[PDB]
Amino acid sequence: KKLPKCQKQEDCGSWDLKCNNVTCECRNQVCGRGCPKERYQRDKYGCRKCLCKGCDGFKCRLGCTYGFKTDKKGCEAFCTCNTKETACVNIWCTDPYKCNPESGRCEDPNEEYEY
Amino acid sequence: HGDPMPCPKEDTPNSVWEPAKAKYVFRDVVQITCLDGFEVVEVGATSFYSTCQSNGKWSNSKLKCQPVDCGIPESIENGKVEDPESTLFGSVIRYTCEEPYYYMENGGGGEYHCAGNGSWVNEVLGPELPKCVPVCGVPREPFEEKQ
Amino acid sequence: IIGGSDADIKNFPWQVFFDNPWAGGALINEYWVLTAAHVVEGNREPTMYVGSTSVQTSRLAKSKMLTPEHVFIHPGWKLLRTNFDNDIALVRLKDPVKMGPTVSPICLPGTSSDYNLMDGDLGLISGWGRTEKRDRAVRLKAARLPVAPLRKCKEVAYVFTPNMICAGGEKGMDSCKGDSGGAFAVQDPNDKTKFYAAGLVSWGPQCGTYGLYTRVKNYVDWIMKTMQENSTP
Numbered sequence: 001k002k003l004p005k006c007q008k009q010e011d012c013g014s015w016d017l018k019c020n021n022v023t024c025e026c027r028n029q030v031c032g033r034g035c036p037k038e039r040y041q042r043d044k045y046g047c048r049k050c051l052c053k054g055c056d057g058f059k060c061r062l063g064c065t066y067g068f069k070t071d072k073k074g075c076e077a078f079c080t081c082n083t084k085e086t087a088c089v090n091i092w093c094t095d096p097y098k099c100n101p102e103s104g105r106c107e108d109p110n111e112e113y114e115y
Numbered sequence: 116h117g118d119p120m121p122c123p124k125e126d127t128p129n130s131v132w133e134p135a136k137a138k139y140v141f142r143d144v145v146q147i148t149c150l151d152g153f154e155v156v157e158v159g160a161t162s163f164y165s166t167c168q169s170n171g172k173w174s175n176s177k178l179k180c181q182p183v184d185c186g187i188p189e190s191i192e193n194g195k196v197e198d199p200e201s202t203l204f205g206s207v208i209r210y211t212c213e214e215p216y217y218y219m220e221n222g223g224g225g226e227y228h229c230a231g232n233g234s235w236v237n238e239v240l241g242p243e244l245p246k247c248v249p250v251c252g253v254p255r256e257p258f259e260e261k262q
Numbered sequence: 263i264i265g266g267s268d269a270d271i272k273n274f275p276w277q278v279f280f281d282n283p284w285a286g287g288a289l290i291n292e293y294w295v296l297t298a299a300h301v302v303e304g305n306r307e308p309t310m311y312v313g314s315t316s317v318q319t320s321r322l323a324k325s326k327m328l329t330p331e332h333v334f335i336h337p338g339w340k341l342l343r344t345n346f347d348n349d350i351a352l353v354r355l356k357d358p359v360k361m362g363p364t365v366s367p368i369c370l371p372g373t374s375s376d377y378n379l380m381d382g383d384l385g386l387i388s389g390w391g392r393t394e395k396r397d398r399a400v401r402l403k404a405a406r407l408p409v410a411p412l413r414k415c416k417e418v419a420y421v422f423t424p425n426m427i428c429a430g431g432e433k434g435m436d437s438c439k440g441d442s443g444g445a446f447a448v449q450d451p452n453d454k455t456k457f458y459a460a461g462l463v464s465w466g467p468q469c470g471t472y473g474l475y476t477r478v479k480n481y482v483d484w485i486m487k488t489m490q491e492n493s494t495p
């Protein structure tokens with residue numbers, strides 16, 4: 001499908017998208033744990049989702065300290081947390097994002113948060 | 116030989132003597148009954164006996180009918196009661212909850228007086244004290260959505 | 263909360279912050295917190311904070327912390343291929359919470375038909391869970407959601423029961439990971455100045471559309487019975 005014109009974010013109809021001056025546009029946000037190889041899903045517009053192929057993405061809405069336990073496909077378990085040991089097991093971070101062993105999440109160390 | 120020495124009546128604004136005789140005499144016994152709100156303390160009662168003694172004086176001259184004392188009001192959780200000038204019979208206290216975060220669950224109005232029987236009582240709750248419990252479901256400020 | 267807005271803790275003074283794992287709860291009186299079963303399942307002595315808009319580590323150390331005494335998981339939780347029915351639990355506190363401008367309880371639903379959620383009802387969700395920007399929110403977020411037909415939660419294997427409320431769909435607003443256990447606060451139809459906990463953030467598809475909430479109305483009797491049976495002497 002073709003991209004829709006966007007007045008605001010609400011018009012794009014998906015969080016995989018982001019609006020601009022040339023009013024919508026494919027958002028390719030950094031994925032928390034990412035997907036292996038080229039195993040990402042894509043929507044009607046072909047924008048990269050933060051969900052791996054074969055995964056439905058259904059889960060409890062619990063904030064896992066070391067991230068959700070993910071398989072070799074990149075599928076996050078429905079409601080199983082990583083231990084401190086599997087925090088960086090099955091994760092796909094690209095520079096400058098590296099897996100943070102304390103959160104089980106792809107992070108850039110140089111990145112500075114506003115708070 | 117002669118005459119049994121008579122004991123005089125009393126100023127009894129706080130009690131009632133029974134039996135009520137014009138002339139009391141050696142070994143006569145009165146039952147002295149305090150009026151409502153008054154008691155005798157020996158630890159208190161509402162009546163006592165007095166005997167006309169051979170010296171023309173009443174026994175138990177050490178027992179008087181005095182106002183009943185409900186004592187210092189007991190405090191409640193999550194509430195306040197201001198300390199009254201007196202805690203004697205007829206004295207009035209007011210309980211109020213910590214508003215607006217608490218309210219009086221059992222109602223009653225929080226107003227208590229010192230009853231004849233010695234308890235702080237409320238017209239609705241009797242001697243049962245107010246219960247101050249949390250107000251639920253009220254945000255301190257309304258959530259305002261981003262326009 | 264995705265698609266939401268900044269909220270002050272004063273807007274949701276019943277909101278409880280669970281840490282490790284990252285989650286939410288709802289204070290329902292001075293000795294009890296309501297949350298989802300899956301939040302305290304292997305977390306029977308949960309770390310809980312109240313009274314603060316922010317959950318920055320710096321600020322947590324200055325916040326009111328709640329001391330758990332006992333966690334009561336609902337008997338039907340994981341009793342009977344994924345099935346999240348009866349996703350509800352009660353945390354009894356050791357000490358009574360002092361209420362104030364930043365800390366106060368939310369109401370429970372009544373038992374009458376007036377508290378049967380259906381089309382037309384609206385709720386507020388609140389929490390420090392994932393947003394559009396980050397996987398966790400430092401400052402409290404919130405959003406208003408409509409109740410939605412259950413049919414719309416099950417699209418694009420899982421058990422959907424009448425103990426679950428479907429909500430969302432409008433403007434991408436939804437709850438996400440980190441929001442579990444938080445209350446779906448709904449206006450009380452009989453006392454419109456009050457909110458009550460009609461739902462608890464439970465589970466759903468990848469956030470941004472719809473989600474499922476534990477329908478609290480069906481547990482009121484169990485909640486009442488548990489609180490009475492574990493009184494405060």
Ligand SMILES: *[C@@H]1O[C@H](CO)[C@@H](O[C@@H]2O[C@H](CO)[C@@H](O)[C@H](O)[C@H]2NC(C)=O)[C@H](O)[C@H]1NC(C)=O
Nearest residue numbers: 230231232233234236237238239240241242243
């Ligand atoms: C002292 O007198 C008061 C009179 O009010 C008694 O209050 C009553 O208490 C009983 C229960 O204890 C209630 O059933 C009545 O309704 C109350 N009277 C009211 C509300 O007017 C109080 O009990 C007495 N104190 C005692 C007997 O120790």
